[PDB]
């Protein structure tokens, strides 16, 4: 059981640039290979035997190392690179792997779109209560989101689901959600999202408020 | 070609068993060792077990050890891997693979996957929930709007919304996982002269409960 460490676990391309990821070994191996997946799909074979470039793949795609250290090459990428890569060794069973690089496709600052949305009347017949925060459209990835209840900032009961990469325009999106009882939602009155972004000169914040309309 | 798919997969209860098939077509399958991988849903692969060319040799991962068991059919080019007392890190799409050569340890070939879930929850429908703004005047060329998911299982869920606009923007949010049921969100972006004067709905498909359910997206 030889542990491979794969660096870095994600980055970011512009299609032209090179792109190299390490693959580091517990203990000397004998032959490394290297796989690409994107989602939804099952993974193919790039490089076999530490070196040798598999049958049909782009010849941009390149493979050394020896010893405990392993790295593969992309001369000049392309926009179809985009993926995660895993480093497989072997040495003697077990067959083992990287965690894997996520190559992510470099794109041009974006700011997110930022909408909040009260629960509707259906969700508060059964008794809870969901305000839902959208922040869409935006890059790079990292960006942080801030709850107020009334002016108050809350964090316990929110949970936050991000998009892949769009295939389309290369964002990302997030989704926000608060989720309250309907009997602690109508006892507060102003609910505020408050997106932080790079590009942000200010935070975003969206807000409604229960009796005003 | 060569071609390998996979087949068996499902829900199974926790403890419970589960016999996975693999059929193989185009190359002579009798000549070639094969493998079985995994890959639980967001994360990375593993490698779970191997057999020779004529099942002489065996080798297993260690986690799956004294209860899987690979085993093949020359004849009738099929692979099987028999997995019992089965539990929730078992949950994996799982992958039959082979090399280009007799029995070398690497995965030239690989068959699309068959999902194996592990778990106790019982077959739900979701709940939906139409999301539209709260009351006040808009702005903008836009408007964004969206359903919420809730408490639906197992995952396969299929969101699709009807708009007045080819120029849409959709987004599918990945689903959450809580007290044994899913929870997602989906949202759609139409031009501002499209809604409220033109319906929007978005229609929730649950296969494995053989449900759908529309909702229509109502201003204040």
């Known amino acids: 059981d030889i542990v491979l460490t794969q660096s870095p676990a994600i980055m970011s391309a512009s299609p032209g640039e090179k792109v190299t990821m390490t693959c580091s070994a517990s203990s000397s191996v004998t032959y490394m290979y290297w796989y690409q997946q994107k989602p939804g799909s099952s993974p193919r074979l790039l490089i076999y035997?530490?070196?040798n470039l598999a049958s049909g793949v782009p010849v941009r795609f390149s493979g050394s190392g020896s010893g405990t250290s392993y790295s593969l090459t992309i001369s000049r990428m392309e926009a179809e690179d985009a993926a995660t890569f895993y480093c497989?060794?072997?040495?003697?069973?077990?067959?083992?792997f990287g965690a894997g690089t996520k190559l992510e496709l470099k794109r041009a600052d974006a700011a997110p779109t930022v909408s909040i949305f009260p629960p509707s009347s259906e969700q508060l017949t059964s008794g809870g209560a969901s305000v839902v925060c959208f922040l869409n459209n935006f890059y790079p990835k990292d960006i942080n989101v801030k709850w107020k209840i009334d002016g108050s900032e809350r964090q316990n009961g929110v949970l936050n689901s991000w998009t892949d990469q769009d295939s389309k325009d290369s964002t990302y999106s997030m989704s926000s959600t608060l989720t309250l009882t309907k009997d602690e939602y109508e006892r507060h009155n102003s609910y505020t999202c408050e997106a932080t972004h790079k590009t942000s000169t200010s935070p975003i914040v969206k807000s409604f408020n229960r009796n005003e309309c | 070609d060569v071609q390998l798919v996979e087949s068996g997969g499902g829900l199974v209860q926790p403890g419970g068993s589960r016999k996975l098939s693999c059929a193989a077509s185009?190359?002579?399958?009798?000549?070639?060792?094969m493998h079985w991988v995994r890959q639980a849903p967001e994360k990375g692969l593993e490698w779970v077990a191997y057999?020779?060319?004529?099942?002489?040799?065996?080798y297993y991962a260690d986690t799956v050890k004294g209860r899987f068991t690979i085993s093949r059919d020359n004849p009738k080019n099929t692979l099987f891997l028999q997995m019992t007392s089965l539990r929730s890190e078992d949950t994996a799409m799982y992958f039959c693979?082979?090399?280009?050569?007799?029995?070398?340890?690497?995965?030239?070939?690989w068959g699309q996957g068959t999902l194996v879930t592990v778990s106790a929850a019982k077959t739900t429908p979701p709940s939906v929930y139409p999301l539209a703004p709260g009351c006040g005047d808009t702005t903008g060329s836009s408007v964004t709007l969206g359903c919420l998911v809730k408490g639906y299982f197992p995952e396969s869920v299929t969101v699709t919304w009807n708009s007045g606009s080819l120029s849409s923007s959709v987004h599918t949010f990945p689903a959450l996982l809580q007290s044994g049921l899913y929870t997602m969100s989906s949202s759609v972006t139409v031009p501002s002269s499209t809604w409220p004067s033109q319906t929007v709905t978005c229609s929730v498909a649950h296969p494995a409960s053989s449900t759908t359910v529309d909702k229509k997206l109502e201003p204040s």
């Open positions: 185009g190359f002579t399958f009798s000549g070639f060792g």
């Open positions: 035997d530490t070196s």
């Open positions: 057999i020779s060319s004529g099942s002489s040799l065996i």
């Open positions: 497989q060794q072997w040495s003697s069973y077990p067959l083992t």
């Open positions: 693979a082979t090399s280009l050569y007799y029995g070398t340890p690497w995965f030239a070939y």
